[PDB]
Amino acid sequence: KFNGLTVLPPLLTDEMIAQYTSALLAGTI
Amino acid sequence: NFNGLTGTGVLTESNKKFLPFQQFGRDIADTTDAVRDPQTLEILDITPC
Amino acid sequence: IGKIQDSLSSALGKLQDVVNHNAQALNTLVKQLSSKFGAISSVLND
Ligand SMILES: *[C@@H]1O[C@H](CO)[C@@H](O[C@@H]2O[C@H](CO)[C@@H](O)[C@H](O)[C@H]2NC(C)=O)[C@H](O)[C@H]1NC(C)=O
Known part of the structure; x- marks a missing residue:
């Protein structure tokens, strides 16, 4: 937004990060 | 060019409400983002290409 | 574990400062x- 300035999105979405944390949590319990 | 305001961008119908003495608006960081057409008195947003 | 929610809701300064x-x-x-x-x-x- 403006002149020549942009923001790039992350590769990992928030859903994918939740999947990593639920796998760690399901593994240890 | 709106009576002196020189710029580039896409003009679209806005949803802002100016005060009855204001010609154009600026965003945070002080860059013009809306103007009023002198003839029709309608507020138009200016988005970058 | 039930108390965590109070401690956070009343805390995320390290994340807010970097943003x-x-x-x-x-x-x-x-x-x-x-x-x-x-x-x-x-x-x-x-
Ligand atoms: C500038 O002049 C134009 C005409 O050239 C005016 O347009 C009129 O606008 C009113 C509504 O405000 C309409 O009812 C008229 O029919 C319009 N006239 C024409 C010929 O289209 C315009 O209002 C004027 N601007 C100012 C600020 O007075």
Whole structure:
């Protein structure tokens, strides 16, 4: 937004990060 | 060019409400983002290409 | 575990500061487009 300035999105979405944390949590319990 | 305001961008119908003495608006960081057409008195947003 | 929710709701300063600090630096960059730096104007159309 403006002149020549942009923001790039992350590769990992928030859903994918939740999947990593639920796998760690399901593994240890 | 709106009576002196020189710029580039896409003009679209806005949803802002100016005060009855204001010609154009600026965003945070002080860059013009809306103007009023002198003839029709309608507020138009200016988005970058 | 039931108390965690109170301690957080009443805390995330380390995450808020890094987001805010970067935004302040980006806004500071834009504010430099309205300085003369020792010139007659800041606008190329003048
Ligand atoms: C500038 O002049 C134009 C005409 O050239 C005016 O347009 C009129 O606008 C009113 C509504 O405000 C309409 O009812 C008329 O039919 C319009 N006339 C024409 C010929 O289209 C315009 O209002 C004027 N602007 C100002 C600020 O007075």
